[PDB]
Every structure is written in C-alpha cells, then in structure tokens.
C-alpha cells in the first residue's frame, strides 16, 4: 500500500520575484527533484522513469515545463485580479498524486494550500474550494474552471497518468522499495533524576519496536521519540526512560525490526 506524492512549493516575494521547487516521493523514498534553477526534472533513483518509454517521458516532462512557466504567470495575474484583497509575500503549496491499493484500484488527489492553509482541490472535472476557504477564492475558481484545456489535462493526469506511472515505478523500484537495513543501537544518559536514552539508527523500513526492559519485564515508562531521517534513506529513533539514580542496574534496551530475522538487539546498561 503506497502513496505517491508530488510536492510543489512556490514563494512569490513581490510582483517580479518568485521560485518554484518540487520533490517527488513514493512512500518515504524520493524519486524526483525539480529545482527552480533546473530546466528539466531530475531522477533521484535509477528507476525514476518507471516503465515509461523515452518518448512518453519527454512528452510528460514537456507538459510540466509548460506548466511551471504558466503557473507562475497565472498566480501573478490572479494576485492582480484579487488586489488588494491579497498581497505578497505569497506561499503556494501543491500536493498531488495517487494512493495505490490492491488489485487495479487507486485514488488520485490534487490539493492546494495558500499561506500554509489547504483551500483548493481538483475533484471530478473541476477546481473547488474546500470547507473553511475564504469567499474571495470563488473568482479564481471561476477563472480556473473557464479553462477547459487545463481541466481535460488534469483529469487525464489524475485518472490515468498517475496510476499507470506509479504501477511502472513499483515494478521498476521493487528492490529499493523492499530493501531491509539493520538498526544499530547504543546507550547514554542525562539529568537525583536520570533520563536514559536508547539510540536506534540505520533501520529500513520504518516500522520498529523499541522498549526498555528489566529481564522479561517491559518497562511501560518508555517514551518513544519521533522518526528522524538519516541522509542515506534510513531511519533514526530514540526511546527515553526516566529513572531514579542508582536504579540503572540490570536495565536493557530491546529493539525489534524486520531486518534482524527474529534475532533482536539487547543492550544492557
């Protein structure tokens, strides 16, 4: 079960200055990058083209190249149109892609945030505002919905292109998508109060179990931290336990992860 996400960020500082940057994710693996400085979309994996032929990819890239330039002017014009209801600086975020289900099932999405708030989506055959969006956006919506060429292209992208492309990617990227990388753990402490820290690093995929232990007894005081990325597309997590000073003895950190093949990591303090 995989979510493919095209994430676009644009900053418009004033009427003349802007940049648009994109990253593409399949699950938590980066597949593409498109910097404002670059004329072309960059592959960040060898399999980033999926099952598309060179001609299909060139065509799809060309459509995106036209899109980026067109998007930029459109925002600038919509700002002029709504003036002086909205002013620079302006942030626009797009999140577009498809979630892939078993069989031949998928759901596509295209969500738009404005100053960090989700306000607009494409749905069915047209752009629409979502609950909580300001009323002034009805004019941009009407203007966007006037463009039948764009609506036809977006419908095809979302209904057909996205799931077909992602199916190709899942086939082409299988060995990276299914990689297993071992976690390595180590221990330390911080401030008669003592906070023990179990550090767990280098694991892939994300699902992992980390607990403080006294023998067979699970210490139900363990606070699991956030998942933090490493630079090499592996994960980092730490689990903390609060104890009295002197109470350190006999305590262990147990780690469970799919790469270990049942052979858990146990580190005694």
């Amino acid at each position, epitope marked *: 079960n995989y979510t493919f996400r095209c994430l676009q960020m644009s900053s418009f500082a004033n009427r003349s200055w802007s940049r648009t940057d994109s990253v593409v994710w399949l699950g938590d693996l980066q597949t593409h990058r498109w910097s404002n400085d670059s004329a072309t979309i960059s592959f960040t994996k060898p399999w980033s083209q999926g099952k598309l032929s060179n001609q299909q990819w060139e065509k799809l890239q060309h459509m995106f190249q036209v899109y980026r330039v067109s998007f930029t002017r459109d925002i600038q014009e919509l700002v002029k149109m709504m003036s002086p209801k909205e002013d620079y600086p302006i942030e626009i975020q797009l999140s577009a892609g498809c979630e892939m289900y078993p069989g031949n099932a998928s759901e596509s999405f295209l969500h738009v945030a404005f100053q960090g708030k989700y306000v607009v989506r494409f749905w069915g055959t047209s752009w629409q505002t979502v609950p909580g969006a300001p009323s002034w956006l009805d004019l941009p919506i009407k203007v966007l919905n*006037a463009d039948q060429g764009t609506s036809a292209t977006v419908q095809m992208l979302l209904n057909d292109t996205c799931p077909l492309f992602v199916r190709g990617l899942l086939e082409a990227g299988k060995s990276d998508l299914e990689k297993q990388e071992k976690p390595v753990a180590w221990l330390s402490s911080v401030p008669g109060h003592r906070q023990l820290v179990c550090h767990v690093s280098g694991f892939y995929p994300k699902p992992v179990w980390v607990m403080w232990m006294r023998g067979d007894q699970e210490q139900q005081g363990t606070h699991r931290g956030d998942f933090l990325p490493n630079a090499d597309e592996t994960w980092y997590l730490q689990a903390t336990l609060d104890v009295e000073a002197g109470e350190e003895a006999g305590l262990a950190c147990r780690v469970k992860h799919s790469s270990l093949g049942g052979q858990d990591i146990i580190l005694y303090w």
Partner: T-cell receptor
Amino acid sequence: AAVTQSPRNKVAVTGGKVTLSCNQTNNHNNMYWYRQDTGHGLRLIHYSYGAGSTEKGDIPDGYKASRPSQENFSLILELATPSQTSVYFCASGDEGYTQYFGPGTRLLVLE
Amino acid sequence: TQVEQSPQSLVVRQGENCVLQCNYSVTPDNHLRWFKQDTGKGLVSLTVLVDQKDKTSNGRYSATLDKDAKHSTLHITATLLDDTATYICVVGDRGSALGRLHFGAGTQLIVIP
C-alpha cells in the same frame, strides 16, 4: 456582448491631454486597451480586472489608465506625442478567453 | 515577433481561391482566431480553432490548425470584391481571462472585380 468607444476620431496637439474612453454594458470584469500601428499586430497598453484595478500591459509608457466603474475604462494621454498617433482598440471579457473589441479610435497628434 | 503571417499582401481576381498562412512560436497555444479587418473598420471574427489538429468553416472561409507544427491556414473560396481587407491571425495563450493575445501583423488581400 457590445463595446463602444468615444471619441471615434481625434486630432490633438503635442503636449495636450487626450482621454480615450471605452464603455461596456455586458457586466464584464475585464477590460483591455490596445494600439494598432502598420507593420505590427495589436499591442497591449493597459488592462483592468475591475473597478479600481489598472495594470500595465506590454507598452504602458506615456499612457495612464483609469477604471472608475465596471462600465468605463479610460486611456489618458497626459502629454500627447506624435508617436501616439495610432488606432486604439478597447476590449472587454468575462472569465472566458474571448475579448470583445470596440470599433476603434483613430488619433492623430500633430506638432 | 511570436506570430508571423504570409504572404504580406496578395492580389487575386474575383472568383479565384486563395490561402493565407499563420506561423507562431507562442507557448502555450490554447486557441487561434482569424479576424477580417476592412479599411478603417474594426475586427470581425471569422473562426476560432481550439484543437491539436483542427478544421473549421464559415461560409466560403475554411481554416486549419496544427498545434504540433504551430501553423494555421485560412482558405477563402471563390473570392468576391468584399473580401478586400486585412486578415489577422491571433493566438491566445490560455483558455481563460488569464490569457494574453498575440497578434500577427496581418495579410492584405486585394480582389480585382
């Protein structure tokens, strides 16, 4: 959808103030001013997305625009020059791509 | 310029057919309109082409558009004296009010009665 222009024809002097007016009863938000000179396609001077909005086109220099109401879009030449001798076209439209053009205004700025 | 018409001008005899060309570099290209402009007068729309490979007609006018080649032709069948006019090609870069229009400088047709 109908657009009208006044005056239809105008002789003016260098340094004079000339105002070209365009009226439209279609309830169109958007209005556009162009000039046509031989050897060139129509070129955009100023446009407007509604009352109070004026925007620079491709060749805005020497022209001011005014949109006092939904109906009226004016092109103001504060200090007329011989280079502003031309045929001027106003257009209007809604959210759609079609622009509805007025009949044109011929301007001659004499020295 | 981004929109070029050919020929610049031509003279034909009444009853003859003629073809006018428009080539452009406008990106993107949503639609293309042909205008007829009589001397002194304004702009009368003859046809608009919207599709990748398009064909339209309006009486004795017919037109083609090929978006891949960025090329359009206007064909006038059996010309009459009243066809004497400038014919103007216009490319719209959006399917909405957000578009800019890119005008060609026109083709002058003279029809000898």
